[PDB]
Amino acid sequence: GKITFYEDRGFQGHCYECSSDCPNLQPYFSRCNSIRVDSGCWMLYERPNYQGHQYFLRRGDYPDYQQWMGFNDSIRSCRLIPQHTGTFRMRIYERDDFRGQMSEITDDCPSLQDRFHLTEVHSLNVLEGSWVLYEMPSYRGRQYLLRPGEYRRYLDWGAMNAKVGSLRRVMD
């Protein structure tokens, strides 16, 4: 994977090229207002150690932080997300701790409301692949990376509530 962070918009100003996970990008650049992703699927984070607002980016040119639905120009850590192939799989649950009705998801879902008549998911188990959870339908709003593993409360994927609008498999 290869990604380049620019301090100013339109690919101007001080910049930095990265090809791995980095828990603290502050030793390399101070702000980010545009990005070129050459390869790889990336999750970017507002704060060091993969904290704060999260943003999903794939190959392409991003001339302003609005293009990754950014809240501000802070990008202070990043993950190169492993690219799974074959079947992605997760289980979503109505209640905490894998309780309530369970639904299995093995493809993209642009509206959990349309598919399941749900507005909230309170726990989920990612069995195969990485995913991005979105606050709003059609892959909009706040974003949360779901790596394989157990998420017994919505707090575990970094959200401040259980609202889930859409879900996307991490694929290039």
UniProtKB/Swiss-Prot annotation:
It comes from the Eukaryota. Residues 83-87 are annotated as: Connecting peptide. GO terms for biological process: lens development in camera-type eye; visual perception. Residues 1-39, 40-82, 88-128, 129-171 form the Beta/gamma crystallin 'Greek key' domain. Disulfide bonds join C18-C22. PANTHER family: BETA/GAMMA CRYSTALLIN (PTHR11818), GAMMA-CRYSTALLIN B (PTHR11818:SF101). Crystallins are the dominant structural components of the vertebrate eye lens. This is Gamma-crystallin B. It comes from Bos taurus. The gene is CRYGB.
